[PDB]
Design an enzyme around this catalytic site. Structure first.
Site, PDB file in Angstrom:
ATOM      1  N   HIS A  88      16.265  59.550  48.694  1.00 30.26           N
ATOM      2  CA  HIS A  88      16.427  60.955  49.084  1.00 30.26           C
ATOM      3  C   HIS A  88      15.298  61.459  49.974  1.00 30.26           C
ATOM      4  O   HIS A  88      15.456  62.531  50.571  1.00 30.26           O
ATOM      5  CB  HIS A  88      16.618  61.886  47.873  1.00 30.26           C
ATOM      6  CG  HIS A  88      15.347  62.249  47.176  1.00 30.26           C
ATOM      7  ND1 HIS A  88      14.901  61.601  46.044  1.00 30.26           N
ATOM      8  CD2 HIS A  88      14.406  63.186  47.467  1.00 30.26           C
ATOM      9  CE1 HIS A  88      13.738  62.130  45.676  1.00 30.26           C
ATOM     10  NE2 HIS A  88      13.421  63.099  46.519  1.00 30.26           N
ATOM     11  N   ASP A 120      18.347  55.668  43.566  1.00 33.00           N
ATOM     12  CA  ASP A 120      17.546  56.450  44.522  1.00 33.00           C
ATOM     13  C   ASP A 120      16.345  55.605  44.964  1.00 33.00           C
ATOM     14  O   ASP A 120      15.219  55.743  44.483  1.00 33.00           O
ATOM     15  CB  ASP A 120      17.129  57.764  43.870  1.00 33.00           C
ATOM     16  CG  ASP A 120      16.438  58.713  44.823  1.00 33.00           C
ATOM     17  OD1 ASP A 120      16.482  58.470  46.035  1.00 33.00           O
ATOM     18  OD2 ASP A 120      15.910  59.739  44.329  1.00 33.00           O
ATOM     19  N   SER A 174       8.235  63.305  45.287  1.00 30.35           N
ATOM     20  CA  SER A 174       9.363  62.421  45.567  1.00 30.35           C
ATOM     21  C   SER A 174       8.898  61.125  46.178  1.00 30.35           C
ATOM     22  O   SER A 174       8.164  61.137  47.164  1.00 30.35           O
ATOM     23  CB  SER A 174      10.271  63.071  46.610  1.00 30.35           C
ATOM     24  OG  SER A 174      11.053  64.110  46.118  1.00 30.35           O
TER      25      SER A 174
HETATM   26  N1  LIG Z   1      10.247  67.872  37.902  1.00 31.82           N
HETATM   27  C1  LIG Z   1      10.299  66.724  38.491  1.00 31.82           C
HETATM   28  N2  LIG Z   1       9.914  65.630  37.827  1.00 31.82           N
HETATM   29  C2  LIG Z   1      10.779  66.553  39.869  1.00 31.82           C
HETATM   30  C3  LIG Z   1      11.516  67.553  40.500  1.00 31.82           C
HETATM   31  C4  LIG Z   1      11.922  67.407  41.811  1.00 31.82           C
HETATM   32  C5  LIG Z   1      11.601  66.273  42.538  1.00 31.82           C
HETATM   33  C6  LIG Z   1      12.040  66.092  43.969  1.00 31.82           C
HETATM   34  N3  LIG Z   1      13.435  65.666  44.033  1.00 31.82           N
HETATM   35  C7  LIG Z   1      14.391  66.497  44.433  1.00 31.82           C
HETATM   36  O1  LIG Z   1      14.148  67.616  44.904  1.00 31.82           O
HETATM   37  C8  LIG Z   1      15.820  65.976  44.357  1.00 31.82           C
HETATM   38  C9  LIG Z   1      16.379  65.737  45.764  1.00 31.82           C
HETATM   39  C10 LIG Z   1      17.736  66.423  45.802  1.00 31.82           C
HETATM   40  C11 LIG Z   1      17.697  67.507  44.763  1.00 31.82           C
HETATM   41  N4  LIG Z   1      16.668  67.047  43.812  1.00 31.82           N
HETATM   42  C12 LIG Z   1      16.381  67.549  42.600  1.00 31.82           C
HETATM   43  O2  LIG Z   1      15.450  67.125  41.934  1.00 31.82           O
HETATM   44  C13 LIG Z   1      17.249  68.695  42.029  1.00 31.82           C
HETATM   45  N5  LIG Z   1      16.307  69.695  41.493  1.00 31.82           N
HETATM   46  C14 LIG Z   1      18.153  68.135  40.925  1.00 31.82           C
HETATM   47  C15 LIG Z   1      19.240  67.185  41.423  1.00 31.82           C
HETATM   48  C16 LIG Z   1      20.327  67.926  42.200  1.00 31.82           C
HETATM   49  C17 LIG Z   1      21.411  66.973  42.691  1.00 31.82           C
HETATM   50  C18 LIG Z   1      22.026  66.185  41.541  1.00 31.82           C
HETATM   51  C19 LIG Z   1      20.959  65.438  40.767  1.00 31.82           C
HETATM   52  C20 LIG Z   1      19.878  66.393  40.281  1.00 31.82           C
HETATM   53  C21 LIG Z   1      10.867  65.284  41.907  1.00 31.82           C
HETATM   54  C22 LIG Z   1      10.464  65.423  40.594  1.00 31.82           C
END
Ligand SMILES: N=C(N)c1ccc(CNC(=O)[C@@H]2CCCN2C(=O)[C@H](N)CC2CCCCC2)cc1
Ligand SMILES: CC(=O)N[C@@H]1[C@@H](O)[C@H](O)[C@@H](CO)O[C@H]1O
Ligand code: NA
Ligand code: NA
EC number: 3.4.21.5
Lengths: 250, 29, 12
Positions: free
Chosen positions: A43, A99, A198
């Site tokens: 992603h 991913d 990420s």
């Molecule tokens: N707290 C964490 N440990 C964390 C949070 C975000 C990240 C960074 N990662 C993202 O932005 C990913 C990329 C796309 C959206 N996303 C999320 O995480 C959405 N919020 C949920 C998806 C929403 C789509 C269905 C699965 C679930 C990495 C780690």
């Protein structure tokens, strides 16, 4: 990283920053797995819901960094990408299943005190260490809170969570290509990855051979460091046959 | 460098311990 | 910046 601390110098020498050429900005974390291969989350490179689809020439990798925003002259090394490889069954349409992505560098990077590869797990190291309660370590330059950004690389150690607890914390469909980690509300301690982390590594230090192994990739979560929520990570060992196929072929 | 992977120049290679790696070891029960 | 400019050689 939420509720982490500043990394020590050389603590995570496999850390990589994925950097956009124009405008110049951080895109993701990543990890060094050899002198010419970098591992990240798919992603970070491809996410059509957000109109994200990078090509090789859009991006650089910065290796050996500690400071987030500084150009670390004589320490960091900046490499161009030869080719991106995204898992062919990466599921951006539903739940981020599989991913994972690889990036081949145009030229090999020289290792140094600050630049060194992490190991990828064999089946037995993975089976031994991927257990509920066992802690790994996550690193990154992402957000310090859900709702800002660090001066230097952040580090937090977090326990792997039982799969039923992971599943019961979310409405998203969890697969065998994921695991979750974080403290439970009743455990008191806190911490999580967050947006901007990420693609970075979840590592464990084997007590058998005293080497660091990358067991996960920072993938997703719902907010950051919320009580009752956990961070989700790509299960590297489960996808290692794909990694090996790409490196062997290309 | 697969052969040498996971051994940090400023830590394992010089038998120095980072400040929180023991927390990981203590969890591997 | 927020980021310090990197050397131009890496953007060519
Ligand atoms: N707290 C964490 N440990 C964390 C949070 C975000 C990240 C960074 N990662 C993202 O932005 C990913 C990329 C796309 C959206 N996303 C999320 O995480 C959405 N919020 C949920 C998806 C929403 C789509 C269905 C699965 C679930 C990495 C780690
Ligand atoms: C899911 C998606 O849209 N992927 C596209 C791919 O089809 C296209 O060939 C490529 C060109 O750069 O960009 C990306
Ligand atoms: Na559920
Ligand atoms: Na939480």
């Amino acid at each position: 990283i939420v509720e982490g601390s500043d990394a020590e110098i050389g603590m995570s020498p496999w850390q990589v920053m994925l950097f956009r050429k124009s405008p110049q900005e951080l895109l993701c974390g990543a990890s060094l797995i050899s002198d010419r291969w970098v591992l990240t989350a798919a992603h970070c490179l491809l996410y059509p819901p957000w109109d994200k689809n990078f090509t090789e020439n859009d991006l650089l990798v910065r290796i050996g960094k500690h400071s987030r925003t500084r150009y670390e002259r004589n320490i960091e090394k900046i490499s161009m990408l030869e080719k991106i490889y995204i898992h062919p069954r990466y599921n951006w349409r539903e739940n981020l299943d599989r991913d994972i992505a690889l990036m081949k560098l145009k030229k090999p990077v020289a290792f140094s005190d600050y630049i060194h590869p992490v190991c990828l797990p064999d089946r037995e190291t993975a089976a031994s260490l991927l257990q509920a309660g066992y802690k790994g370590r996550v690193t990154g330059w992402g957000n310090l809170k859900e709702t800002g950004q660090p001066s230097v690389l952040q580090v937090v150690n977090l326990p792997i969570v039982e799969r039923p607890v992971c599943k019961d914390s979310t409405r998203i469909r969890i697969t065998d290509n994921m695991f979750c980690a974080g403290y439970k509300p009743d455990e008191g301690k806190r911490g999580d990855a967050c947006e901007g982390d990420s693609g970075g590594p979840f590592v464990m230090k084997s007590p058998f051979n005293n080497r660091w192994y990358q067991m996960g990739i920072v993938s997703w979560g719902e907010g950051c460091d919320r009580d009752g929520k956990y961070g989700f990570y790509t299960h590297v060992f489960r996808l290692k046959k794909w990694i090996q196929k790409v490196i062997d072929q290309f | 460098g697969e052969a040498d992977c996971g051994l940090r120049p400023l830590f394992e290679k010089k038998s120095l311990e980072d400040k929180t790696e023991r927390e990981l070891l203590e969890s591997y029960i | 910046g927020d980021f310090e400019e990197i050397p131009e050689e890496y953007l060519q």
